C-alpha cells in the first residue's frame, strides 16, 4: 500500500466527517486528545530540523522535535515526531498540513498515541542529549 | 465492514454475551456512524446465535440502547430498523414487559414536527407487529390500528406510505374480521387515498385494497367495488 | 436655519384606502389568515415608507382606525356573528405562532 | 497557478481573408516572441490560423486578452489548440544520431 | 476609518469591530459581504426597473421603492411579537382562551 | 544502578508532562483556581460585586479618545523588560482555536485550505437557516 | 455576460415566485428559465442572434390593473422575446452607468 | 516539457496538412476616446457561430472538432473522401449533442454504414473527441457506446486501431465510477475477441516495460480482461515469458501484477491453471527488488 | 537593513477581511416576492428558535478535561 | 458627510461563474495528479 | 409597575399621548423616581436615539419640579455606573441627556458630577462624555457652547470638568477636549497652563 | 430538598438574623414563567435544589457560567438565556449522576433512562 | 562524521517560494509594495548618444542584473552582477504641512550587496538599505556605461 493512499485516507477521514455532520466532541481527533505528539512522514531528506520547526510553527509553539536519523551516516530517514505546546495544535496541523507539498513531495501528518522517548543510554552525540533533556523552546 | 465481520466471527467462538457486553454501552454513543456500526454487530450476532446467552441485566442495557439509538437517528437508512427487528425477534417472549415503553415511545413520536421522525415511528410499528402476536398482546396492537387510522389524513406522502405499511402489517397479524376499525370503516377511507400519485402511497394502498377484495368482500356494496374498480384504471399509469 | 414639515400626500392616502378596499372586496375567496396577511402587508408598506410623516397627518390616523375595524369586522362576518365578547382582541392580536391571526396594530391610539 | 490545458499554440477563428504576414505578426507578437504561424490555404480551412508562442505564459496572456479583439471590423475568436495527435513517425535514425552526438559531447554514458 | 486603521495596523478586519455597525446604514453594512455580491455589483438601474414592473405584472407592489439585497432590510419588527404577547397577558393568559387543555399536551413550549 | 533508574524516572516525568500538553496544564491550573475562588463566594453575584465591578471598569472600549495616551504610557513603563520571543510578523490567518503561531514561523501560509473551507461552510449554515425559516412559516 | 444573464433570469423568475397552477404560457416561461439555467451558452447565443437579426415580433396582449382611481396598462410579451429583452435591459444599464450617460439629476438613482 | 524547445521538422508532426507556414518578417524582432458617430455595417450580421441546418447547438469548446461544419460548401465540389468525413462529422455531432430522436437515428446510421465508412475514418474522428479536456461522463458514455457498436461491425478491420482504442479505454478500468469500470471491461473483452490473441499480445508487449507507471498499471489491468475473454492457456506462455525477464524489474513487476489481476477477475476459473500460475510467481518472493517481493505476496494471496 | 533569504509570503498590504464575515446570507432577489401580499413574512427569525431537543445521557467525565483530575482531589492537592 | 455610502466603497468588492451549481461536472474535475 | 410603564410607552405613537396616559394613571409621588428611571431604560433599549424619549422626559420636566429633580438624580446615578452599559445603550443615554441639557429642561448644575482625570475616569466614562459633548456641540454650536460653558454663575460647577488646580490634570483635559474635536473650549485652559 | 434552601444565602441570612417570628413570601421562579411553563419551571427548580443538596460547591460553580452572569436583586437564581439554561441543566444532571455513581460504585453509562429519572428525582 | 542535528535554516525552504526558472531569487517584495501612481521614465545615454527611453510605470518592482533571462531590466556589461539592484515602488506614510499624515507611493532603490555596487549621484550606497529616490537622480551600475536618469511625466 502506497504512502499516498495513507495521505488520502486521512483526508477522506475528514471529508467523510463533514458529510455525516459529526460533532467535534466526537470527532476522530478526540481519540488522540490526551497526546500532543504528531508524526510527520515522507519529508524530503534535505530538510533539517530548523526547516520542520520553521513551517510547523504556523499552528503553535513546538516543544520538542525528533527527526530520526540514520545511526551510521546520520542522514535523515525522512520521518520525525513533533510535540506541540497546545494539544489543539495537533488537530490544526493534521487537518491543515496533511498532504501538502514541500520540494515536490507530499507529506503525511497523523496523530501519534503514547509516543515513547529515546533512551539516553547511547553517548553518541551531545546536542541530541541537550535536545532530549531540555529541548527547543523560548527562554525568558 | 471488515470490523463488523471479524467481531461476528469472534462471537461464534467466544459467545454472544462476551462480545455484546463489551459494546452495548456504545449504543448510546453520540457519534451516529459509531452507533450504526455497533448496531450492525449486535444485529448479526443475535441473528446467528440467538439470545439464550443474554441474561436479564444485559437485556435492559440492550433494550434501552436500541430505543436510544432509534430515537437519535438522522441518516434515514434501514440499519436501526433492521437492528430493532432482529433484536426483539430474537428476544421473543422476554420482551413483553418492555412493550408498554415501546408503544408509548412510538405513539408519542407519531406526532412530532419532523416528517422523518413520524415516518420512522410508523416503520417501527410495521417491524414489531409480529412480536406483539407472539407476546399475545393483541389488545395493544388492536389499539394501535385504531390510532393509525386517524393518521390517514397525512399530507406528506412519505409519512402516509409508512402509515399504510404499518396498517398492512396489523391486518396481517390480527386478521380482517377482528380488525379495529372494522374493514367497513377502513375500506371507504382508503378509496380516495388511491388518487395519491406518489408511488409509495399507491403501492401500500393497492396491496391493502387488493387483499380486502378477496378475503373480505362483504364489507362493501357492489357499487363501491364497481367505482373502486373504475379508479384502478388510473393505477395502470 | 429652517424647518421642513412632513405630511403624507393625498394621493398616497387614497392609494392606501383603495388597497384596503380591494382587500375587503375579495374576502369571499380568502381565508382569515390571508385576509390578515394582506392587511399586514399594506400596513407595513405604508408605515415603513412614510415613517414620521404619518404622525403629523390626522386624516391618516382616522383612516387607519376605520380600516383596522373593517378588517376585524370582515373576519367576524365570516363567522356569522358580530358580538364583541365572542371575539375579544386576543383572537386577533395574538401572533400566528400561538394560533392567532396575528394582525399588526395601528388603530388603538388616542387621536 | 495555471490549468493543465494551457498550450503554446493558439487557434484563431474569424480572421479576415488575405491579411498580410506583417499585420499578423504585429498583432500576435506583442505578447511575446513567436515560434511559428500557420495560415489555412485550403478553402474549407481558409480564414483561420495557428500561432505558436515561444513562451507558454505569453500564450496564456494572449488567450486571456486577445479574445474578442476587433480586426478588420470583426471579433477575433482565440482558443487553445489541443495537440491531441501526431501526424508523422518520429524518425528514429535522426533522433538516434542526435542523442549519440549529445552523449558523445558530454561523456554521459 | 476602520479600514484605514486596519491597513495601518496590518491586521485583517474581524467580526468584532463590525459587530455594532452591522445592521446600520443605508445600505446596510452587511450587504457588502453577502454571498452574491459579485453578481450584484453589475445590477444597475434596479430601482427604476422596480418602478417599471407595474406595467408588466398585474398586481401592485407595495415595496416598489426598495430591494433587500441592495439596501438590506430597512426594518426589523421582531420585538413587536414579544411585546404583543406580554400586552395580551403572557402565553399562559392567552392560552386560557384556547382548546389547549383539550389537546392534552403537557407543556405549551412544544406547540408547533 | 539506582541513580540511573531515578534519572530515567525523572526523564519519564518530564516527557509525560510534555506529551499531555503544557498549555493544557496551565489552563487546568487556572480552572481549578477559578473554581476555588467561586466556591468561596456566595451563590448570587450582583452587579455590585467587587471584582466584576473592577473588571467592567478596566475594560478598554473602542472609540476611547485618550486610548493612545494610556497605550503610550504602557509602552514607556515596560521598555526595560525581558520576555519570551513571540511571533511578530504580518498577521496570520485565523484558526478555529485562536492559537497564535510560534516565533520560528516564516509567515508563509502553507495550508491545504482546510481551515478556510471550514469557516466557509459554517457561514453557509446561517444563510440556509434564514431561507428555511421563511419557507417554513410562509403558509401559516 | 453570464452575470448579466443571471440577473435577468432572477428578475423573470421572481415574478412567478409564489403562485400555483399557472397558465400554460407561464409554465412555458418557467420552462425556458430553467432551460437557460442549464446551459447558459446556448441561451446567450440565441440572445445575440435575436439582437442581430429579429425585427418582426409577436403580438402583445394588454390588460388593465384597476387601482380604483385610475387604470394601469399591463403588457404581456412572449417568453422567448422576454428573455432577450431582459438581457438587453441589464446590459444597457450596466454600460450606461459605467460610461456615465445619465447625469445626476435623473432620478430614481440606485444610491438613495 | 511544454516549456522545451520544438524543432522545425518535428513541429510539422503537430498540425494537419492544410496549412502553410509563414516566413517571419524582418521588422519583427523577437523580444480615452471621445464621442464618435458610427457607420452602418452588415458584417456582424453575416458571421455565424453555429452550423447551418438541423444540427444541434455547437458549444464553444467543441469548435476545433467540428469546425468544418461551419463553412458551407457544395457536396459535389469536394472529393468522396472529404464528403465521407463530413458525413461522419455531422453524425457525431448529432450523437453528442442531439435530442434523443436525433441521437437514435444517427446512432443507427453510423452502425449500419460502419463497414462502408471504413474503420479508419471513424476512428480518427471518434478518438480525438474522447481525448478532450471538457467531456462530461454522459458524453464519454455515448462515445464509447459508438465504439462498441461499430466494433461488432468491423470485427476484423480494427487491427491497426487496437492500441489506439486501448489508450482511450484503459483509463476507464480505473475509473471511480462502477459502471464506467464495467463498460471499460466489456469493450476491452470485445476488442480482444475482435482482434484475437496475437494482435493483442504484440500490441501490449511494449506497454509492459513502459517508463510510466500509469501505462503499466492499466496494461496490467487490461491483460486480465483479455485473459477472461480468450482464456488462460492462450496467454500463459507469454505471461511466463514476461515474468521471467531479467533485464527489467518493471516487466517482472508487471507480469506478477497481471497474475494478481487475473485471480481477482477470474475467481474460480483460475483453478485448473493454479499450478501453472504459482510456478510463474514463486521466483518473485525471493527477488532482490522489494516491490517485486511485495507484489508476489499479493499475487499469492489473490490466488 | 532589510533581511533577505526569507521565503516569500504572497500577502498584499491593502485591507483584508477574515473569512467569518462573508456569505452570511445568500440570494439574488428582493425579499418581497414581487409584492405578493398573501404570505406571512412579517418577521425574519423564529419566535423561540432552536434553543433540550436531545435525550439526556450522562456525559463522559469532563473533570479530566477542565481540571485534569477530579475537582475534589484537585482542591485536596491545593 | 453623505447619508448613503460613498460609491467608491461600493465599487470595491471584498474578496467565477454563478451557474457553477447548475452545469453537469466534468471528468477532469474529479481526477487527481495520477 | 415597570411593565405598565413600558406598555404605555409602546402603545402610544406620539410623545404627547404617552405623557397624557402616564399622567392619567395618577401614581403617587413616591413612585416618581422609578418612573423617570423607567423612561430612561426604555430609551436605552432602542437601536438609535429617538427624539420621542427626550421630548417625553422634557415634558415631564416642565410639568412638575419633582420630575426635574428626579432626572437630575438619575444623571449622577447613571454616570457613576456607566461601565455597566453596552455601547449602544451608552450612546443613547448620552444623547438623551444632551437633549435634556440643550432644551434647558435640566440645569447645567448636574454637570458638576463629571470630573476629568487619568485616575478619575474609566474608559467607558470617557466615551460617555465624548458622545455627550460632541452631541451638545452639534445642537448648539461652538460659540454658543463656549458662551454657556464659561459663565460667572456656573463657575463653581465646572471645576471638576476644567481642572485648574493640577497642571497634569489641566494638560489631560486639554488633550481630551482636543481629541474629540472641541479644541476651542480648551483655549482659556491653555493660557492657564502658560501662566 | 429544602435544606438546600437553608444553604442559599438569601434565606439563610434572613433566618439567622431574625429576631422575631415572621412569615415571608418569596418567588422560587424569577422570570421562568414568561418563557417556560410551570411544569418546566418545577423541573428546573427540582434539579437546582437536588444539585445544591448533593454537592453545594460544585453547584455554585455551575450556576455561575460566566464571570459576567449576575442575578437581579429581587431574584434568587441567575439571569441566563434559554440556551444557557439548557447547558446548565445538563451540567447539574451530570453533577447528580456523578455523585451517585461515585458513591455507590456503579458505572453511570450502564444506567437506563428510568434509572436516571429515579436518581435525579431522588428515589432510593 | 555524522551531521548531528543542526538547528539552522537551509536554502531548501527558501527555494520553494522565490525560485525563478533560471535561479533562486534573493529578493522578495515587501508588503508595502504597490504599483506606481505616476509614470516614471528611465533615460539611458552611453555618453553623447541616447538609448531607448525606458518606461518603468508598469509594475511595482524591477530586478536589474546580469541575467537577461532573470532580470526585468538587463544590464549586459560584465561589471554588473547576476542580481544587482531592485527598483521598488512602496507606499510610505508621510506628514503634510497641515500635520495630517497619509499614504504616498514613492520609488526607492535597494542594492543586494553587489560586489561593484551602485552609485547614486556618484556616491555608492550601502547594501540591504532602502534609499528614497528624488525627482532627478543618476544611477550607475558598477563600471558599466549608460548612466540612468529618472523623470516622471508631469515634471516640467
GROMACS .gro file of C-alpha atoms in nm, chain E residues 86 91-92 106-109, chain L residues 33-37 39-40:
model
   14
  683UNK     CA    1  -4.681   4.046   2.701
  688UNK     CA    2  -4.853   3.294   2.700
  689UNK     CA    3  -5.049   3.141   2.984
  703UNK     CA    4  -4.824   1.871   2.889
  704UNK     CA    5  -4.644   2.192   2.824
  705UNK     CA    6  -4.703   2.470   2.580
  706UNK     CA    7  -4.340   2.502   2.478
 1604UNK     CA    8  -4.293   3.166   3.356
 1605UNK     CA    9  -4.254   3.430   3.083
 1606UNK     CA   10  -4.082   3.176   2.859
 1607UNK     CA   11  -4.148   2.836   3.011
 1608UNK     CA   12  -4.447   2.665   3.161
 1610UNK     CA   13  -4.433   2.231   3.458
 1611UNK     CA   14  -4.089   2.310   3.320
   0.00000   0.00000   0.00000
